[PDB]
C-alpha cells in the first residue's frame, strides 16, 4: 500500500552498446573471453557486447532438416556403377572442407 510499487515490480530489459550494431546479423560473434585486468584491459561484458546471431533458428542438423540429413538421401537415391549409355558422371561433393 505505497507508491513506487510498479517501478519496483518492473524489470529493465537488456541494453546493448553501440558496438553490437556492427556485428554479423546472420552468424553470431565468436565466443571471446574478455581480459579482466587492471592495466589497459577493458572489462567488456559479452552479454551486451556480443551478437548472438540468426543461426540459432536457421540451423538444424538435429532433425530431418539441415544438410546432414540430405546427403545420405542423395547418395542412396544416386545411381552408381558404370553408365552403359552416356559419358558417365561423378557424385557431387556437398561436405564443406572436412
Amino acid at each position: 500500500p505505497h507508491w513506487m510499487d510498479p517501478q519496483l515490480m518492473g524489470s529493465q530489459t537488456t541494453q546493448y552498446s553501440r558496438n553490437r550494431g556492427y556485428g554479423d546479423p546472420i552468424r553470431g560473434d565468436l565466443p571471446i573471453v574478455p581480459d579482466d585486468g587492471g592495466w589497459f584491459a577493458t572489462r567488456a561484458n559479452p552479454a551486451h557486447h556480443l551478437h548472438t546471431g540468426a543461426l540459432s533458428m536457421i540451423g538444424g542438423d538435429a532433425s530431418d532438416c539441415g544438410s546432414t540429413a540430405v546427403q545420405q538421401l542423395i547418395k542412396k537415391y544416386e545411381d552408381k556403377g558404370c553408365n552403359n549409355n552416356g559419358l558417365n558422371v561423378m557424385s557431387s561433393h556437398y561436405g564443406g572442407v572436412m
Binding site: 500500500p1 507508491w3 510499487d5 510498479p6 517501478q7 515490480m9 518492473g10 524489470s11 529493465q12 530489459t13 553490437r20 550494431g21 546479423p25
Partner: protein, 462 residues
C-alpha cells in the same frame, strides 16, 4: 412432382446425390449440424454510464486538464469527451474586408485534442494524438458507423462551409452544437480487456487532455487568392472565449458478489496495444528528393503508418496533400485539380539490408489495406505497412521486435508535383499561390504486457 405450391418432394432428388466426393465433407458420427444452436450460460452483470469527476485544471482552449477515474466500479470499458463548440460570427471590420471567409478546420475533432494520455499514479500507461486518431479512424473504420462518426466530430458540411461577412450574400453563422469524441484506449479496444478497479484499490488512475487555442482552430481564408492568415479577436463578433465547457463520460460495469469475491486476490496478465510516435522531420523537395528517417522503437511493433503532412498554414489541419484546399463555387470548399499525395515511393532499411525495395506508393496505399485491414482510406495519404495478418484484431498476430533490432530506417522519395508545389507562382484559387512546406510523421503500434496483482498495476517488463 406436380410442381405444387409446397414443393418438398423435389428436395429428395438432390439429397439422393450423395457419393464419395461429398462423403468426406458431410456425414459422420461427430459431424455437427446447423438448425440446433448449442447454449451455454454466461455471467450476470449490469452496466450504466457515469459522469467522471475532475481533479485538476480548467477546460479551456490551449490549456490542459485532468479527470480522475471513479472507484467502486467493478469494471470500466468506455470513455468519450463531449465538448460544446462556440458560436462564430464574422464581422465586416475584418482585415480581409469583404473578400474573407471563416470556417472550422477539417476534422474539428481529432483536432484541438493532442497528447491525450492515460496514466496510473504518475506513470503514463499510454497516450495518443491527432495523427494516430486520423490513421486509426481511416484504416479500421466499420461501415454503417462511418456516417455517424463523420457527423459527431464535425465535417457535417455545415461547420466546414465557408461563410462570408455580414454585408455579403452569405450571412449565415456557424451553429454552436456539441460534439463527441470517443477515446481509443486499450480497455476500450475489446470487452474482454477492461480495467479491474475492484482489484486495483491502491493505484490512482488519471486521464490528461491538452486542448488547442481557437486561433489554430478557425481557418480564415481569402475568397479570391486562397490565402490563409491568422485570425484575431477583433475580426469576429463576440471575441474569442478561451474557456469552454468539456466533460468526460465513461461506462462502468457491475458483476455479481460471488464472482467478484472469487476473482478478488489473484494475479492476472493482460495484453495491450500502445503508440510510439517518431519525431517529426522537415522535408524540402527543392534541395533533395530522398528523405531518410531513423526509427528507435522498443517493443514488438505491429504496424507502421507513415504520412507527409502539409504544414504551410498552422491553422489548417489534417491536410496530407501537397496543395491546400481553397474556396469554391456555391460557398463550398473544394480541392484544386493538382491535389495528389507527395509520396512517390518508400523503402525500409535494416543495416543497409533493405527489407523492402523501392515499392510504389499505390502499394502501401491500396494493396496493404486491402489484405490486412478492415477498411481502405478514402482520402489521399495514409500509407501503412503491417507485419500482422489483421491489424484490428486484439489477439496477437505476426510482428517483429525492435528491441533486439539494430537501428532501422525508412527512405521516402518525393514527387514532381511536390517539387513544383514547393515553389510559389500559382495563380488565384490554385492552392499553391504561396510556397509550400511539408513534414514527415511516423507512427508505430506495439504489444505490451501488464500484470495485475497485489492490488496494484504495473509493467512486469517495463
Amino acid at each position: 412432382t406436380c410442381t405444387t405450391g409446397a414443393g418438398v418432394t423435389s428436395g429428395f432428388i438432390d439429397l439422393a446425390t450423395y457419393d464419395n466426393l461429398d462423403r468426406a465433407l458431410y456425414g459422420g458420427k461427430d459431424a455437427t449440424t446447423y438448425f440446433i444452436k448449442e447454449h451455454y450460460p454466461v455471467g450476470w452483470f449490469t452496466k450504466l454510464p457515469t459522469m467522471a469527476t475532475r481533479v485538476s485544471g480548467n477546460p479551456a482552449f490551449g490549456q490542459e486538464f485532468s479527470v480522475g477515474v471513479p472507484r467502486s466500479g467493478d469494471y470500466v470499458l468506455n470513455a468519450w469527451l463531449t465538448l460544446k463548440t462556440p458560436e462564430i460570427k464574422l464581422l465586416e471590420t475584418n482585415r480581409l474586408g469583404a473578400n474573407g471567409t471563416v470556417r472550422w478546420t477539417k476534422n474539428l475533432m481529432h483536432n484541438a485534442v493532442e497528447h491525450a494520455s492515460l496514466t496510473f499514479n504518475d506513470i503514463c500507461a499510454q497516450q495518443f494524438n491527432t495523427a494516430y486518431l486520423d490513421a486509426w479512424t481511416q484504416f479500421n473504420m466499420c461501415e454503417g458507423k462511418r456516417i455517424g462518426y463523420d457527423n459527431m466530430i464535425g465535417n457535417t458540411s455545415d461547420m466546414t462551409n465557408p461563410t462570408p461577412a455580414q454585408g455579403q450574400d452569405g450571412a449565415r453563422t456557424l451553429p454552436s452544437k456539441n460534439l463527441v469524441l470517443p477515446l481509443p484506449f486499450f480497455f476500450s479496444r475489446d470487452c474482454g480487456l477492461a480495467l479491474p478497479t475492484v482489484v486495483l484499490p491502491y493505484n490512482e488512475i488519471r486521464i490528461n487532455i491538452k486542448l488547442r487555442s481557437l486561433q489554430e482552430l478557425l481557418v480564415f481564408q481569402n475568397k479570391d487568392t486562397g490565402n490563409v492568415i491568422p485570425i484575431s479577436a477583433t475580426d469576429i463578433a463576440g471575441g474569442l472565449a478561451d474557456t469552454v465547457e468539456a466533460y468526460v463520460y465513461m461506462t462502468v460495469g457491475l458483476v455479481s458478489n460471488v464472482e467478484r469475491c472469487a476473482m478478488a486476490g489473484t494475479v492476472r496478465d493482460m495484453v495491450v496495444e500502445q503508440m510510439q510516435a517518431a519525431p517529426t522531420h522537415i522535408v524540402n523537395p527543392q534541395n533533395t528528393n530522398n528523405v531518410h528517417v531513423d526509427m528507435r522503437f522498443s517493443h514488438a511493433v505491429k504496424a507502421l503508418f507513415f504520412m507527409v503532412q502539409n504544414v504551410t498554414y498552422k491553422s489548417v489541419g489534417s491536410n496530407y496533400t501537397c496543395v491546400t484546399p481553397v474556396n469554391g463555387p456555391g460557398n463550398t470548399v473544394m480541392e484544386p485539380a493538382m491535389s495528389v499525395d507527395p509520396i512517390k515511393s518508400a523503402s525500409l532499411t535494416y543495416e543497409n539490408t533493405t527489407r523492402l525495395a523501392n515499392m510504389g506508393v499505390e502499394y502501401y496505399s491500396l494493396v496493404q489495406p486491402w489484405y490486412f485491414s478492415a477498411s481502405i482510406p478514402v482520402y489521399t495519404g495514409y500509407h501503412m505497412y503491417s507485419y500482422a495478418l489483421n491489424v484490428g484484431s486484439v489477439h496477437p498476430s505476426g510482428s517483429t521486435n525492435y528491441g533486439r533490432l539494430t537501428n532501422a530506417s525508412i527512405t521516402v522519395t518525393m514527387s514532381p508535383e511536390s517539387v513544383v508545389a514547393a515553389a510559389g507562382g500559382g495563380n488565384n484559387n490554385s492552392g499553391y499561390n504561396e510556397p509550400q512546406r511539408f513534414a514527415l510523421v511516423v507512427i508505430a503500434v506495439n504489444h505490451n504486457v501488464i500484470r495485475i496483482m497485489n492490488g496494484s498495476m504495473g509493467f512486469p517488463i517495463l
